[PDB]
Nucleic acid binder design. Structure first.
Ligand code: MG
Ligand code: MG
Ligand code: MG
Ligand code: MG
Ligand code: MG
Ligand code: MG
Ligand code: MG
Ligand code: MG
Ligand code: MG
Ligand code: MG
Lengths: 138, 199, 190, 176, 109
RNA sequence: GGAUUAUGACUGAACGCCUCUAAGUCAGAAUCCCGCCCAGGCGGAACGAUAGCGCCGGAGCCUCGGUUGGCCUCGGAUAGCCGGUCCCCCGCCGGGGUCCGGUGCGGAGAGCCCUUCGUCCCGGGAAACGGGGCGGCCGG
RNA sequence: UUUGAUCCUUCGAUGUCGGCUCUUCCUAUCAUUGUGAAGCAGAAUUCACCAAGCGUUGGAUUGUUCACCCACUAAUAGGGA
RNA sequence: GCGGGAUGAACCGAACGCCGGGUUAAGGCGCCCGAUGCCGACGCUCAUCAGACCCCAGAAAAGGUGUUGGUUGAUAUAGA
RNA sequence: GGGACGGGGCCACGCGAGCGCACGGGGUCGGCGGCGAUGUCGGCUACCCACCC
RNA sequence: AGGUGGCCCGGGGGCCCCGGGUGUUACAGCCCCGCCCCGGCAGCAGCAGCUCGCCGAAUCCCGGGGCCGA
């Protein structure tokens, strides 16, 4: 089975390379493994980009297969992609690895000082919900 | 401080290309279940590739001849001994760090085993090609112990289904006390989200 | 070159309801169920429609060596439906010139002894494949009818008693004996 | 020629030099594909010294300049008339591609003739490169991308960065 | 009251294929896997700690049984994360695979 | 005895017909490989009998060195999987189906548990079924 | 596995023809095992494939390797180290 | 004499006082074995004897509906 | 000729006297700290043994 | 025309898509040509830290690592 399709008018997410972590669309399919790619709002110039550096989401937006740069900006800020991308459960765990890499050593000390009391409470509840299922059983 | 490895789905040259470097760099490696390894190419070509090695015995006293081991362990140890300088005291003091087992012994079943992704058949082979197992190969070439290994690799799968059930049974209790409590750990999470741990 | 898409569809009649879990199909109906797993072929089986009235199979990005696998599954599925609705009946004669060929069924349809072939005292203890029920015909002098549902279990076991009885060391332009196959047919008729 | 990098695209005009015999000579011009502005000159005296009696010692390269592309943001369907020698007897060819620029559809032409014919770099005479509208293409590797509603999935994404997590614990996933 | 150094496995001298130059000894560092990361470990004082039979002096302590060979990290090597090192006295062949330390303290942060 | 060569056949496309073949499936041999049979490795196991000797917790002396936190476990698929419902049919809780949630894996090894400067007062929170030291059984 | 051509190594020495005895090896297969085509009805015979595990003899004359002839046989195949 | 061609009187780089630092040549970078643990780029190829780098240690005429390209005319909404 | 208040650049504008910094005819400190008598500090070479090449 | 508003024939769902045909910007869009100061403006081998180059009398400043002091 398949669900996510390459189709004229789909928004992909560039994984690596020079343009790290930007949503961008697909205008055209040149060949088996090459295309014509543009995103005007996330600070990208209209260029040619392969398929091995993009992983793709379930957003489409309707425009012609060689449309110039305006009709994309109309369909883009019409559907408001730059909020629904940031409202997904997929680009919140990106800034989570950014907050994790940008952690000051004091802000690591306040996690060692927050887990250590935090999980001696869960363990003191599981100890009572094993034998809250054992008083009934015995 | 001691590595472990599985043997299903890994290739033979790609695994021994990682392991003959990681041994020489001071790291004890144990590779278990070396009958689920599979070899590239079809079956009958790797069998004639091996029986043309079994025909090569030293002519005047074959007891001095090439010791043809038949187990899939002492084959994987053979094809590591080739990737090592086994005449010098930095080869003979490295092969006593490696330890190879057929099947899986009880000292290494209640431990989490690591899996190399760079040597897997589904990654490093096109999916329209042919592969060949090693166990059915050794049985075809003189290994007498599949009728024991198959049932000792049956009694532990039955023991680990049970251990996965009681792992789920403690996890649900953990997510229900984590549903009851969070009135009083409401403040020990607004300090974790702003440091990126529960997204 | 690399062809981008090729597909094929099969209509199913409404005495049969089919489904699939993953890649192995199952088809049940008037005479039983059959299951065949296609896990070595790497295609996409889709089953379009409410009431499940037809099937469709795809293969993306394939060369000439695997555009062959579009039709040769549709055939083993039309054969899967025929072997459940109708069921197969292979009729096979028994040519002999001078000695009498003796044919006797052991095990209520699941074994065949063969005697007196070319005067050979050597009986041939031929076993069928589990799934096939042989029989001596009626309203005909010499004839076997093999019946069953799976064609793969029928035709191989039919060819076994065709190769069990051969001719050693002589001509086969003159010595023409054996139980040969006449007609491939179904149990009942549409 | 060493087809290294991507082939840039030069336009060369050249001539013989004036004699007391003739007052002014006429001027010729070609289209040369070259990695730089020197082997376009050493290719120009080969395609001129294969058609007219003109040598390097009796001429001068009047102008040798880069030619940009009129529209490098559109997608175009090229078509190339080749002429290549072989191990036994020369041949002509006509072969199409699909690319943006002529420079990339000849970087592609030299790379595909290297792959499918082992025609080396010193055996290839590019005579004519013309872009075409979509009707007169004859070969099936282009006419199949002629659909307005094209649609295909990415079936089997084999992973990379094979050695960064080099010793992991979990088996991967190749369904996306 | 914990470790204040970083692990480093000695790997080989700077050799060609049929020579060898023992005055420049290679290292691998657990955690670094490219040449672009190893700009942190330039000029860091590395060391090597062994032990022997007799008893020797120790700066700020009673004479123990242990000995050291100090050193220094000079420049990178390869595209993977290997790095060279210049010790004062050239190293023995007993330590191929054993453990040396590298410090951090001639810092540049 | 097993796996199969040579060769002989089945279903079945490419080539709307065909066809032993390209994917899959069957029978098959003085050959190959194992048994029966002969030796038993700087390879192990169980059981005994144990002569100034062993089963059990003190300051000291010579030597041999490498280490400077641990992870106490499903099996497997890759043109697919993971978890709740077992509301419901079936097995002595288990799987099968329906359905509800995730799916570039967050019930993530890019990971999680432990965290070592010491003590004395005074309170706020969280424990109260708690912390530590000895008599009743197994995992095997 | 024939004879020739050449002259690189050994002439302060590599013991030089045949046979007896004795292990192993190759296949370009004479016979036996399993299989195809015939101007193959059976019986006989010729042709080819996988295939070298197992066999391939007793004697007169000659210094003989070579030859030639009498018997038996399943077959009296050819050679190297 | 030296680095490379696994090995080697002549081939390819290069010609020497004893030593520190740097960079290169012919060559090479899965492991032995210093170096790709590049998100390397585009394609052809399945062998029951695949194949893999000057001198070099081996091989052909002819064949193939095995496949990938190509070339010339003669049947295409002229149902061929 | 200014155009009737115009900003930046010109090594243009046969005994002058004293002082100092210096990317200047090949490195100095006019800077320091812990270890030392029967168990320890130095000695490359010369003797035995192990290892990399 | 790399076949879209519509229009029109055909099959699926609880109007919508996917189907094949007709014809000119259609309730999408592209391309070619004339003129409006090479129409007007920012900018310029582009800090949309990568659409495509060669350069420095038309080029200068900081900082880091190593080895050596005759
Ligand atoms: Mg006969
Ligand atoms: Mg058997
Ligand atoms: Mg069989
Ligand atoms: Mg210590
Ligand atoms: Mg002599
Ligand atoms: Mg002698
Ligand atoms: Mg032969
Ligand atoms: Mg060589
Ligand atoms: Mg030369
Ligand atoms: Mg090498």
């Amino acid at each position: 089975v398949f669900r996510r399709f390459v189709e004229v008018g789909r928004v992909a997410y560039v994984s690596f390379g020079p343009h790290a972590g930007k949503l961008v669309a697909i205008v055209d399919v040149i060949d088996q493994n090459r295309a014509l790619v543009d995103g005007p709002c996330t600070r990208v110039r209209r260029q040619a980009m392969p398929f091995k550096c993009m992983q793709l989401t379930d957003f489409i937006l309707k425009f012609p297969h060689s449309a110039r740069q305006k009709y994309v900006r109309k369909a883009w800020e019409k559907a408001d992609i730059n909020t629904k991308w940031a409202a997904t459960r997929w680009a919140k765990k990106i800034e989570a690895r950014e907050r994790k890499a940008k952690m000051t050593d004091f802000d690591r000390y306040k996690v060692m000082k927050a887990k250590k009391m935090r999980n001696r409470i869960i363990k003191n509840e599981v100890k009572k919900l094993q034998r809250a299922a054992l008083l009934k059983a015995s | 401080q001691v590595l472990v490895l599985d043997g299903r789905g890994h290739l033979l040259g790609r695994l021994a290309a990682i392991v003959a470097k990681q041994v020489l760099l001071g790291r004890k490696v144990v590779v278990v279940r070396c009958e689920g390894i599979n070899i590239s190419g079809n079956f009958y070509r790797n069998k004639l590739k091996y029986l043309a090695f079994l025909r090569k015995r030293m002519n005047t006293n074959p007891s001095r001849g090439p010791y043809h081991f038949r187990a899939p362990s002492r084959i994987f140890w053979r094809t590591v001994r080739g990737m090592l300088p086994h005449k010098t005291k930095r080869g003979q003091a490295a092969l006593d760090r490696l330890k190879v087992f057929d099947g899986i012994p009880p000292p290494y079943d209640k431990k989490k085993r690591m899996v190399v992704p760079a040597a897997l058949k589904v990654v490093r082979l096109k999916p329209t090609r042919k592969f060949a197992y090693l166990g059915r190969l050794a049985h075809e070439v003189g290994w007498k112990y599949q009728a024991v290994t198959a049932t000792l690799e049956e009694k532990r799968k039955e023991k680990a289904k049970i251990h996965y059930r009681k792992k789920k049974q403690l996890m649900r209790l953990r997510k229900q006390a984590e549903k009851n409590v969070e009135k009083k750990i409401s403040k020990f999470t607004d300090v974790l989200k702003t440091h990126g741990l529960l997204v | 070159m690399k062809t981008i898409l090729s597909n094929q569809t099969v209509d199913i009649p409404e005495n049969v309801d089919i489904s699939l879990k993953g890649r192995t199909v199952i088809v049940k109906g008037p005479r039983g169920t059959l299951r065949r797993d296609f896990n070595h072929i790497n295609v996409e089986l889709s089953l379009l429609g409410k009431k499940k009235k037809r099937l469709r199979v795809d293969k993306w990005w394939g060369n000439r060596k695997e555009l062959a696998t579009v039709r040769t599954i549709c055939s083993h599925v039309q054969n899967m439906i025929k072997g459940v609705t109708l069921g197969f009946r292979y009729k096979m004669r028994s040519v002999y010139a001078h000695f009498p060929i003796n044919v006797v069924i052991q095990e209520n349809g699941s074994l065949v002894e063969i005697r007196n072939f070319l005067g050979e005292k050597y009986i041939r203890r031929v076993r069928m494949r589990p799934g096939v029920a042989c029989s001596v015909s009626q309203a005909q002098k010499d004839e076997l009818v093999l019946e069953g549902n799976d064609i793969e279990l029928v035709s191989n076991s039919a060819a076994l008693i065709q190769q069990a009885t051969t001719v050693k060391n002589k001509d086969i332009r003159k010595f023409l004996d054996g139980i040969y196959v006449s007609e491939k047919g179904t149990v009942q008729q549409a | 020629m060493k087809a290294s990098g991507t082939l840039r695209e030069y336009k060369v005009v050249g001539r013989c030099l004036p004699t007391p015999k003739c007052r002014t000579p006429p001027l010729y011009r070609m289209r040369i594909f070259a990695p730089n502005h020197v082997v376009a000159k050493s290719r120009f005296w080969y395609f001129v010294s294969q058609l007219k009696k003109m040598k390097k010692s009796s001429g001068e390269i009047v102008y040798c300049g880069q030619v940009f592309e009129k529209s490098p943001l559109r997608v175009k369907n090229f078509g190339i008339w080749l002429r290549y020698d072989s191990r036994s007897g020369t041949h002509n060819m006509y072969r199409e591609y699909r690319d943006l620029t002529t420079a990339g559809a000849v970087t592609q032409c030299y790379r595909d003739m290297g792959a499918r014919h082992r025609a080396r770099a010193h055996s290839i005479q590019i005579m004519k490169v013309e872009e075409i509208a979509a009707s007169k293409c004859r070969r099936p590797a282009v006419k199949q991308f002629h659909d307005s509603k094209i649609k295909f999935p990415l079936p089997h994404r084999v992973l990379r960065r094979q050695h960064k997590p080099r010793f992991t614990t979990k088996r991967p996933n190749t369904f996306f | 009251s914990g470790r204040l150094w970083c692990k480093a496995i000695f790997a080989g001298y700077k050799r060609g294929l049929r020579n060898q130059r023992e005055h420049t000894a290679l290292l691998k560092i657990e955690g670094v896997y490219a040449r672009d990361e190893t700009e942190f470990y330039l000029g860091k004082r590395c060391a090597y700690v062994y032990k022997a039979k007799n008893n020797t002096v120790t700066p700020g302590g009673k004479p123990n049984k242990t000995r050291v060979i100090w050193g220094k990290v000079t420049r990178a090597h390869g595209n993977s994360g290997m790095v060279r090192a210049k010790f004062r006295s050239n190293l023995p062949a007993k330590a191929i695979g054993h453990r040396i330390r590298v410090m951090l303290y001639p810092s540049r942060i």
